[PDB]
Amino acid sequence: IKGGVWRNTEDEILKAAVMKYGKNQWSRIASLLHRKSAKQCKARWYEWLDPSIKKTEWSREEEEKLLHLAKLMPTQWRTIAPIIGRTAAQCLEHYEFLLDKAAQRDNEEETTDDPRKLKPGEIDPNPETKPARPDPIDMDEDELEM
Partner 1 sequence: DTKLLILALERLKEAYSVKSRLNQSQREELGLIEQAYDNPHEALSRIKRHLLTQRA
Partner 2 sequence: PPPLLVYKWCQGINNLQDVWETSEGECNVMLESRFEKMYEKIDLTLLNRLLRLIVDHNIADYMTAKNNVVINYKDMNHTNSYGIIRGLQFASFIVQYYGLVMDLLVLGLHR
Partner 3 sequence: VKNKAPAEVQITAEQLLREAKERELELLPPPPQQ
Contacts with partner 3 by CB under 8 A lie at 8-9, 12-13, 15-16, 19, 134-138, 140
Q: Does 27 help bind partner 2 (rule: CB under 8 A)?
A: no
Query: Phi/psi of residue 89, each to 5°?
Result: -70, -45
The DSSP symbol for 74 reads: T
Q: Does 77 bind partner 2 (CB under 8 A)?
A: yes
C-alpha gyration radius of the chain: 19
Q: How far apart are CA 112 and CA 63, in angstroms?
A: 29
Q: Which of 78, 131, 136, 142 touches partner 2 (CB under 8 A)?
A: 78
84 near 70, Cβ under 8 Å? no
Smallest gap from residue 3 Cβ to partner 2 (A): 18
Residue 13 contact, options partner 2, partner 3, partner 1, none, Cβ 5-8 Å cut-off depending on partner type:
partner 3
